[PDB]
RNA sequence: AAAUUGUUGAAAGGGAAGGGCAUUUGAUCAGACAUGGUGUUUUGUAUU
RNA sequence: AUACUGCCAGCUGGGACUGAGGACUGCGACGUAAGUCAAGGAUGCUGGCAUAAUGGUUAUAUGCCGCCCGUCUUGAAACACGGACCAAGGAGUCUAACGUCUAUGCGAGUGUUUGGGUGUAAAACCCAUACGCGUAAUGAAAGUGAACGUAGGUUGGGGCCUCGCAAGAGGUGCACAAUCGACCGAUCCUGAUGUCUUCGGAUGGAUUUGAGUAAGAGCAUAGCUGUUGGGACCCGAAAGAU
RNA sequence: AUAUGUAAGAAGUCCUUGUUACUUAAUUGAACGUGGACAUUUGAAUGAAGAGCUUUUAGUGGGCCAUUUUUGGUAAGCAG
């Protein structure tokens, strides 16, 4: 009682029903997986600058 | 038997729970007889509190 | 809102006296909340039955 | 409200919504959690991890009485005391007149110091004290003192 | 405010002026085309007594129907055919000549027949059946009044404004011919004059690029 | 025959008419379309559609996330409008002499807000005394911190608070959560 | 009550019957012209 | 001039189907102005019967068409299975614990109804406690336990605040989403004053980690739908045991 | 050849380097950002029937047949 094995047959059709659609984007992206040096300066920077940016608009 | 994202239930009826079965139906019946057997005792100790 | 309700007396067709509303005649009219409340209520007055 | 069931929606339909190539049979993947292991791994994993084995020590005869301690905030500490006279204290913050606060008697066993009560001076009976809880009371004024 | 003399009277009052303009507009519509074609003629003369050959432009405008079923379509060709607005058998709609559309002309070529409108069937399309996409529902054109008031922005006040875009594609050919709902014309009167349609013009066939004889075909279905 | 592009028949997938069987909640649905439909106003027809909105959609807002929005520069004097249940909260011990339209006071906040000397109103009469809304700011409530929210999109690698009965140690804390047992998630 | 039968009777009948679209023929039936109209030759002009 | 092709907002004729629709309206055409029109959908005139005449129903006849229904199936009219016929009965139910959504009440609380009071005696009405869930999490546990900032910075944000009769910006931005942070547990580090001679970790960290905090949102009742154990949609074994 | 990955800008382009515990011999770079300039061609065509997003659940998990590409087989209304 051999059957079918494989096969992509409506695959596509299925896929592109409600599918292909592109992922959305946004302004700054995870920082995750990124080096953790540059995380570490990048927070530091971060700081300073909204710091130095309260007081110039204090 | 297991199906989607549901939490994990442990009912325990595997066994004869429908012999043993108990419906309070007798409420109103036990509330009104234990104020009646209240209300003869009170009457058989009519001083006393 | 409603000023004074008047008192009816056997004795003729109304008296002096008159009383202002409770409030309770203010309070909101709720026809879906009542009609599920005595849905309830009306089960509550039941008695149970089975076969054998 | 049995006659708003689906039941009675599929009346003259020959399957009654469960399908003419795989029919509505007793117990197809098991009964119960069968399998968990085996066939139902996939859901075991994706939506219950952690189900399968055991990992901290035991405690026989254990004691919820002897595990009892609720915990109460600061915030929920001032209201706690009573309004009627929470309003006459909060105008007349001063010492030698701070409320006395049981939590113990509220029914709380710990205080944690989640953060800004005002700054009139109260004293707190608590079996158990948080170090945040303490340094903020001690900051509005009040001192913490300890119960059993 | 009895809003019967002095209303009426300044609405009216707009209505000749823009009927006016209106009819300013179209006569110097029709002394274009006609100086075109005369331009063309003796351009045509003029090379001839030169020596040399007058190439004809390539035409900027097509008008395009698909003319086979909603069935056994492939995914490209039905895409583009929805891009082009060919969504129904017998459907028309004017396109722009570009690399672009004529590549897409070229992937469609077997479910549609296209060629080069000329003025009379531009104009016998809109008058006969024009309808405007105004908030996405097909309402008939039917007014100079409707037309100003839903392509005003661009220009075009009148039927002969829009046609006169159609043909001599401008600057607002696009927005125009987005407003022109897509044509639903009948089947041919006289027959689609081959026995069999799906094959191309060229081999006896009905699909494919008829070039100017889409004005008799499109007169016919229309 | 039509090549269709998109859905036939498909329904517009927003609210109307809520689902609420309320005679007055029908009342002040009827004055806002009324509203909405004659005024253009935008803080009518945002409105209009809150009072379409569903329970869960409607979360209570509390006095202190009110005072927040007071407390917000040049905002003193705005009638803060919240289309649903007001609660009060008991961790703030100051409030404004602000103005509060709402649908549902609890007793605690009302009291609260009569106390600090504001009004407390409704939808009805934030009408007849702001037709076009003016001088309002619209509060909303914390729609995405419930027990429901916090165990949709449950999965690998997501942390979404599994849907479980019992919690402690032997509860799903093992083989999947554990690189001692197993793999973790 | 139905299945299934005998009889008022009606129609059909070249190796089935029943059915759909559409008329014809026979049988049968509802709807509609005292309806809110002419001012005085017919009247059973407070009834018009 | 004429096979031809193209155009005409060129001129005439013969047929057919259709007639939808409203208490002032619109867009237009027509002699130097009265107003009429084929201009936002049929009117005018004239005939026959004041009825089975038109029609509805029904039975035949005629033209064309029409395989026996339910099921399994890629495929049933099937030389696949059930069905001679009719009446009555006949199959997704109730319960315990629940998920999503919805409605209702109250709301950092919520649930009277295990009980007690009273009752027009299983209704109804009322009631100091406790308890369940929530308000705190995290760790195996001992334990510890959520604001260094306007409860933070950036981006986007509905709504709300002016000069404003042609094209025109800022302020605030609380749902929510993305991101960088801060705080609370766990892991790994570091380790100042003081020593029930070795003990509490103050402070400062770490591409680590939590179903957390960061101005609560839950509780209860009910209703589709779905889940599990129960006879479990209904009927059906060969068996096993006392 | 047919298929196939990108890009066709405002989350963009140019002067101030303001912050940094990263980096450089070095106010050198890197990342983030404050100030300023860019409108009806905001940077190809066509279309868009409203973008986007979340929850929950049914049935299904025996397939078969054209035209092309193609494997085993002499071939098959064969098997893949």
């Given at each position: 009682?051999?059957?079918?094995?494989?096969?992509?047959?409506?695959?596509?059709?299925?896929?592109?029903?409600?599918?292909?659609?592109?992922?959305?984007?946004?302004?700054?992206?995870?920082?995750?997986?990124?080096?953790?040096?540059?995380?570490?300066?990048?927070?530091?920077?971060?700081?300073?600058?909204?710091?130095?940016?309260?007081?110039?608009?204090? | 038997?297991?199906?989607?994202?549901?939490?994990?239930?442990?009912?325990?009826?595997?066994?004869?729970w429908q012999e043993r079965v108990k419906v309070h139906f007798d409420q109103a019946g036990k509330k009104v007889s234990r104020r009646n057997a209240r209300a003869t005792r009170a009457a058989k100790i009519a001083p006393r509190p | 809102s409603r000023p004074q309700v008047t008192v009816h007396s056997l004795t003729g067709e109304a008296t002096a006296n008159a009383l202002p509303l409770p409030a309770v005649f203010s309070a909101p009219i709720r026809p879906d909340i009542v009609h599920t409340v005595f849905t309830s209520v009306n089960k509550n007055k039941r008695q149970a039955y089975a076969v054998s | 409200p049995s006659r708003f069931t689906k039941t009675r929606k599929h009346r003259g339909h020959v399957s009654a919504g469960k399908g003419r190539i795989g029919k509505h049979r007793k117990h197809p993947g098991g009964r119960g959690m069968a399998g968990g292991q085996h066939h139902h791994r996939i859901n075991m994993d994706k939506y219950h991890p952690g189900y399968?084995?055991?990992?901290?020590?035991?405690?026989?005869?254990?004691?919820?009485?002897?595990?009892?301690?609720?915990?109460?905030?600061?915030?929920?500490?001032?209201?706690?005391?009573?309004?009627?006279?929470?309003?006459?204290?909060?105008?007349?913050?001063?010492?030698?007149?701070?409320?006395?606060?049981?939590?113990?008697?509220?029914?709380?066993?710990?205080?944690?110091?989640?953060?800004?009560?005002?700054?009139?001076?109260?004293?707190?009976?608590?079996?158990?004290?948080?170090?945040?809880?303490?340094?903020?009371?001690?900051?509005?004024?009040?001192?913490?003192?300890?119960?059993? | 405010?009895?809003?019967?003399?002095?209303?009426?009277?300044?609405?009216?009052?707009?209505?000749?002026?823009?009927?006016?303009?209106?009819?300013?507009?179209?006569?110097?519509?029709?002394?274009?085309?006609?100086?075109?074609?005369?331009?063309?003629?003796?351009?045509?003369?003029?090379?001839?007594?030169?020596?040399?050959?007058?190439?004809?432009?390539?035409?900027?405008?097509?008008?395009?129907?698909?003319?086979?079923?909603?069935?056994?379509?492939?995914?490209?060709?039905?895409?583009?055919?929805?891009?082009?607005?060919?969504?129904?058998?017998?459907?028309?709609?004017?396109?722009?000549?570009?690399?672009?559309?004529?590549?897409?002309?070229?992937?469609?070529?077997?479910?549609?027949?296209?060629?080069?409108?000329?003025?009379?069937?531009?104009?016998?399309?809109?008058?006969?059946?024009?309808?405007?996409?105004?908030?996405?529902?097909?309402?008939?054109?039917?007014?100079?009044?409707?037309?100003?008031?839903?392509?005003?922005?661009?220009?075009?006040?009148?039927?002969?404004?829009?046609?006169?875009?159609?043909?001599?594609?401008?600057?607002?050919?696009?927005?125009?011919?987005?407003?022109?709902?897509?044509?639903?014309?009948?089947?041919?009167?006289?027959?689609?004059?081959?026995?069999?349609?799906?094959?191309?013009?060229?081999?006896?066939?009905?699909?494919?690029?008829?070039?100017?004889?889409?004005?008799?075909?499109?007169?016919?279905?229309? | 025959?039509?090549?269709?592009?998109?859905?036939?028949?498909?329904?517009?997938?927003?609210?109307?008419?809520?689902?609420?069987?309320?005679?007055?909640?029908?009342?002040?649905?009827?004055?806002?379309?009324?509203?909405?439909?004659?005024?253009?106003?935008?803080?009518?027809?945002?409105?209009?559609?809150?009072?379409?909105?569903?329970?869960?959609?409607?979360?209570?807002?509390?006095?202190?996330?009110?005072?927040?929005?007071?407390?917000?520069?040049?905002?003193?004097?705005?009638?803060?409008?919240?289309?649903?249940?007001?609660?009060?909260?008991?961790?703030?011990?100051?409030?404004?002499?602000?103005?509060?339209?709402?649908?549902?006071?609890?007793?605690?906040?009302?009291?609260?807000?009569?106390?600090?000397?504001?009004?407390?109103?409704?939808?009805?009469?934030?009408?007849?005394?702001?037709?076009?809304?003016?001088?309002?700011?619209?509060?909303?409530?914390?729609?995405?911190?419930?027990?429901?929210?916090?165990?949709?999109?449950?999965?690998?690698?997501?942390?979404?608070?599994?849907?479980?009965?019992?919690?402690?140690?032997?509860?799903?804390?093992?083989?999947?959560?554990?690189?001692?047992?197993?793999?973790?998630?």
């Amino acid at each position: 009682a051999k059957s079918k094995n494989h096969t992509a047959h409506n695959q596509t059709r299925k896929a592109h029903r409600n599918g292909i659609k592109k992922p959305k984007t946004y302004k700054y992206p995870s920082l995750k997986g990124v080096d953790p040096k540059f995380r570490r300066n990048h927070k530091h920077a971060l700081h300073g600058t909204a710091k130095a940016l309260a007081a110039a608009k204090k | 038997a297991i199906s989607k994202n549901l939490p994990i239930l442990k009912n325990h009826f595997r066994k004869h729970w429908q012999e043993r079965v108990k419906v309070h139906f007798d409420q109103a019946g036990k509330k009104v007889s234990r104020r009646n057997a209240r209300a003869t005792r009170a009457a058989k100790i009519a001083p006393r509190p | 809102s409603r000023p004074q309700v008047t008192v009816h007396s056997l004795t003729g067709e109304a008296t002096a006296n008159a009383l202002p509303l409770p409030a309770v005649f203010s309070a909101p009219i709720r026809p879906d909340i009542v009609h599920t409340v005595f849905t309830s209520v009306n089960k509550n007055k039941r008695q149970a039955y089975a076969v054998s | 409200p049995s006659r708003f069931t689906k039941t009675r929606k599929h009346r003259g339909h020959v399957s009654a919504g469960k399908g003419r190539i795989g029919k509505h049979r007793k117990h197809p993947g098991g009964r119960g959690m069968a399998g968990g292991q085996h066939h139902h791994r996939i859901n075991m994993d994706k939506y219950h991890p952690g189900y399968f084995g055991k990992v901290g020590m035991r405690y026989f005869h254990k004691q919820q009485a002897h595990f009892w301690k609720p915990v109460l905030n600061l915030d929920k500490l001032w209201t706690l005391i009573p309004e009627d006279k929470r309003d006459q204290y909060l105008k007349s913050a001063s010492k030698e007149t701070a409320p006395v606060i049981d939590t113990l008697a509220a029914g709380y066993g710990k205080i944690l110091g989640k953060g800004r009560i005002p700054n009139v001076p109260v004293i707190v009976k608590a079996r158990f004290v948080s170090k945040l809880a303490e340094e903020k009371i001690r900051a509005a004024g009040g001192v913490v003192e300890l119960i059993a | 405010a009895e809003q019967v003399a002095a209303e009426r009277a300044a609405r009216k009052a707009a209505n000749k002026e823009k009927r006016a303009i209106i009819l300013e507009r179209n006569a110097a519509y029709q002394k274009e085309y006609e100086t075109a074609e005369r331009n063309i003629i003796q351009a045509k003369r003029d090379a001839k007594a030169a020596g040399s050959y007058y190439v004809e432009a390539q035409h900027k405008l097509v008008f395009v129907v698909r003319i086979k079923g909603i069935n056994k379509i492939p995914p490209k060709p039905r895409k583009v055919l929805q891009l082009l607005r060919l969504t129904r058998i017998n459907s028309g709609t004017f396109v722009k000549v570009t690399k672009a559309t004529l590549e897409l002309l070229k992937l469609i070529e077997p479910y549609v027949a296209y060629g080069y409108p000329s003025y009379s069937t531009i104009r016998q399309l809109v008058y006969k059946r024009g309808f405007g996409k105004i908030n996405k529902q097909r309402v008939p054109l039917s007014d100079n009044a409707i037309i100003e008031a839903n392509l005003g922005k661009y220009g075009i006040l009148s039927i002969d404004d829009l046609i006169h875009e159609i043909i001599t594609v401008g600057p607002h050919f696009k927005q125009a011919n987005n407003f022109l709902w897509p044509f639903k014309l009948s089947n041919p009167s006289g027959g689609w004059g081959v026995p069999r349609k799906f094959k191309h013009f060229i081999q006896g066939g009905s699909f494919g690029n008829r070039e100017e004889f889409i004005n008799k075909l499109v007169k016919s279905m229309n | 025959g039509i090549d269709h592009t998109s859905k036939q028949h498909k329904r517009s997938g927003h609210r109307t008419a809520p689902k609420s069987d309320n005679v007055y909640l029908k009342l002040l649905v009827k004055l806002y379309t009324f509203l909405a439909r004659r005024t253009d106003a935008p803080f009518n027809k945002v409105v209009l559609k809150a009072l379409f909105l569903s329970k869960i959609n409607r979360p209570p807002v509390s006095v202190s996330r009110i005072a927040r929005a007071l407390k917000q520069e040049g905002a003193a004097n705005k009638t803060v409008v919240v289309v649903g249940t007001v609660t009060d909260d008991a961790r703030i011990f100051e409030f404004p002499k602000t103005t509060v339209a709402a649908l549902r006071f609890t007793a605690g906040a009302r009291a609260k807000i009569v106390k600090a000397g504001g009004e407390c109103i409704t939808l009805d009469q934030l009408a007849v005394r702001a037709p076009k809304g003016q001088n309002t700011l619209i509060l909303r409530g914390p729609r995405n911190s419930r027990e429901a929210v916090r165990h949709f999109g449950m999965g690998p690698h997501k942390g979404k608070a599994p849907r479980i009965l019992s919690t402690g140690r032997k509860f799903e804390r093992a083989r999947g959560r554990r690189r001692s047992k197993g793999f973790k998630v």
